[PDB]
Amino acid sequence: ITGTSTVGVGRGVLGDQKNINTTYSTYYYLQDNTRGDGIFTYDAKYRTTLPGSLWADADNQFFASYDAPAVDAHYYAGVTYDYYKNVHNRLSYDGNNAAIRSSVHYSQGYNNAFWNGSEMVYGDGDGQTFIPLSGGIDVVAHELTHAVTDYTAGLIYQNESGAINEAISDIFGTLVEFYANKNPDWEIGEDVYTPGISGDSLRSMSDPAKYGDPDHYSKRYTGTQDNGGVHINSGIINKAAYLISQGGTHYGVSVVGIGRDKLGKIFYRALTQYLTPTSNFSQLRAAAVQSATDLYGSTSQEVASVKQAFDAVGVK
Active site residues: 143, 231
Task: Report which secondary-structure segment, H or E, holds 17.
Answer: strand 17-25
- Out of 194, 293, 300, 301, the residue judged to bind Ca ion by CB under 5 A: 194
Q: Nearest approach, Cβ of 63 to Fe ion (angstroms)? A: 31
For 119, 125, 142, 176, 295, the CA distances from 103, given in Å and listed in that order, are 8, 14, 15, 21, 38
Vertex 75 angle, CA 74 and 81, to 5°: 95
- Cβ proximity to Ca ion, 160 vs 191, nearer residue: 191
Q: Tell me, what amino acid is at 278?
A: T
26 is an interface residue for Ca ion by CB under 5 A: no
Give the chain's length. Answer: 316
Window 138 to 157, contacts with Ca ion (CB under 5 A): 138
The backbone region for 229, taken as left when phi is positive above 0, alpha when psi lies in -120 to 50, beta otherwise, is left
57 is an interface residue for Ca ion by CB under 5 A: yes
197 is an interface residue for Ca ion by CB under 5 A: yes
216 is in an annotated binding site: no
Report CA Rg, the chain.
19
Q: Measured between alpha carbons, how far is 14 from 293 in angstroms, rounded to an integer? A: 42
- Per the CB < 8 A criterion, the answer to whether 51 and 44 are in contact is yes
Window 163 to 202, contacts with Fe ion (CB under 5 A): 169
**Candidate segments 109-117, 198-206, 274-282, 296-304, binder of Ca ion by CB under 5 A:** 198-206
Q: Measured between alpha carbons, how far is 23 from 79 in angstroms, rounded to an integer? A: 18
- Per the CB < 8 A criterion, the answer to whether 20 and 46 are in contact is no
Window 150 to 169, contacts with Fe ion (CB under 5 A): 169
Q: Nearest approach, Cβ of 137 to Fe ion (angstroms)? A: 15
Window 99 to 128, contacts with Ca ion (CB under 5 A): none
- Cβ proximity to Fe ion, 70 vs 164, nearer residue: 164
By rule CB under 5 A, what count of residues binds Ca ion?
12
The DSSP output letter for 98 is P
Q: Nearest approach, Cβ of 161 to Ca ion (angstroms)? A: 24
Q: Nearest approach, Cβ of 138 to Ca ion (angstroms)? A: 4
34 is in an annotated binding site: no
> Where on the chain is the footprint of Fe ion (CB under 5 A)?
169
Annotated binding site for Zn(2+): 142, 146, 166
